[PDB]
UniProtKB/Swiss-Prot annotation:
Quaternary context: Clathrin triskelions, composed of 3 heavy chains and 3 light chains, are the basic subunits of the clathrin coat. In the presence of light chains, hub assembly is influenced by both the pH and the concentration of calcium. Interacts with HIP1. Interacts with DENND1A, DENND1B and DENND1C. May interact with OCRL. Interacts with ERBB2. Interacts with FKBP6.
Positions of region (Globular terminal domain): 3-358
Listed GO biological process terms: amyloid-beta clearance by transcytosis; autophagy; cell division; clathrin coat assembly; clathrin coat disassembly; clathrin-dependent endocytosis; intracellular protein transport; mitotic cell cycle
Region span, WD40-like repeat 6: 259-302
GO cellular component: centriolar satellite; clathrin coat; clathrin coat of coated pit; clathrin coat of trans-Golgi network vesicle; clathrin complex; clathrin-coated endocytic vesicle; clathrin-coated endocytic vesicle membrane; clathrin-coated vesicle
Modification type Phosphoserine: residues: 68
Function according to Swiss-Prot or TrEMBL: Clathrin is the major protein of the polyhedral coat of coated pits and vesicles. Two different adapter protein complexes link the clathrin lattice either to the plasma membrane or to the trans-Golgi network. Acts as a component of the TACC3/ch-TOG/clathrin complex proposed to contribute to stabilization of kinetochore fibers of the mitotic spindle by acting as inter-microtubule bridge. The TACC3/ch-TOG/clathrin complex is required for the maintenance of kinetochore fiber tension. Plays a role in early autophagosome formation.
GO molecular function annotations of the record: clathrin light chain binding; disordered domain specific binding; double-stranded RNA binding; low-density lipoprotein particle receptor binding; protein kinase binding; RNA binding; structural molecule activity; ubiquitin-specific protease binding
Main location: membrane
Disorder: Intellectual developmental disorder, autosomal dominant 56: A form of intellectual disability, a disorder characterized by significantly below average general intellectual functioning associated with impairments in adaptive behavior and manifested during the developmental period.
Organism: Homo sapiens
Name recorded for this polypeptide: Clathrin heavy chain 1
Gene: CLTC
Amino acid sequence: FMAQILPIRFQEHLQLQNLGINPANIGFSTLTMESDKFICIREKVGEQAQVVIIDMNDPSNPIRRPISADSAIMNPASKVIALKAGKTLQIFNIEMKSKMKAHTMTDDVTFWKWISLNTVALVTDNAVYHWSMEGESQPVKMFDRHSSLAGCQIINYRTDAKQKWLLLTGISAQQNRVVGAMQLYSVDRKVSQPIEGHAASFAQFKMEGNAEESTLFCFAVRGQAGGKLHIIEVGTPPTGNQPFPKKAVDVFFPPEAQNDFPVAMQISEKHDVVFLITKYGYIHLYDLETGTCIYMNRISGETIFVTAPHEATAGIIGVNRKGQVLSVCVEEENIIPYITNVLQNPDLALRMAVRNNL
Ligand SMILES: O=S(=O)(Nc1nc(O)c(Cc2ccc(Br)cc2)s1)c1cccc2ccccc12
């Protein structure tokens, strides 16, 4: 019953191979998507290093230039790009064709990412730094790396909106298993906590009855107990708030997907829904308040290796290994019908309508 309506809208936005990208460069080491505004690809054509910027508002006109960099990340919003070569980092203003700032690190930066409109996080083998793109400031060390992530491939770093909670995520091969290792750091406490996790995100959520938003930490893991997802408030509730009761739910994997595991998460600011993507190209939806699983489906035939928030729909946008650029968001008009008649969870249907963010 109601087999035809879905709680999500799937969209294809682009096929990068149709825009002249070599499929060999459609991967984590050469293609970045730091927000839904831009895709940046490093390509070696003949002997020439080139960097291609796809403006998602004008994608059929990619800009391609000879630029030598080990890594290239567009600003989430501005026409500004961070470039790295060896231990030397530069931030460049594209629109004004001008160098903004440069810095030479002592240690190699193995992973970097824009964490805000104006700040780029730098991960080295032993520490994490934040670097403002503005003014004269140098990178500032935020914390030292926990031994539990030693030797990991770093896969993500992110913060809460207030930049008081910092999360570093790595994976390692333990025999034939991919084991996720996170470090959660409290700026104010100066304390780290090691956490077995594969994908996470922070979120701000206003509980019924509270005047102030709660800062939530959501992570998903496939460990020895199977797939689990946790939704936890970090630190102490804002003055006047009740605390958010911790939620813990299973994360399902079908029998034919024993080697699947979580790889990405984004949280809808408008809908209070967690989007979880797996290595095999499945998407899951969970309610942020309860952890309730809303929907699961395989949405991509290829691994989706990078994601970002999709701002226009308060959804998730990603790029798969073949170059499909795809998004998923809540279908606002069919979500409650689906919850009512397919999930048959009227409490969730009621709570979503009472939030009234549809
Ligand atoms: O749009 S650009 O400004 N194109 C450029 N092409 C060349 O050749 C540039 C050369 C240049 C060297 C030194 C300075 Br200072 C300024 C520009 S800048 C640009 C700058 C930085 C990174 C880019 C990556 C992909 C596409 C264009 C890029």
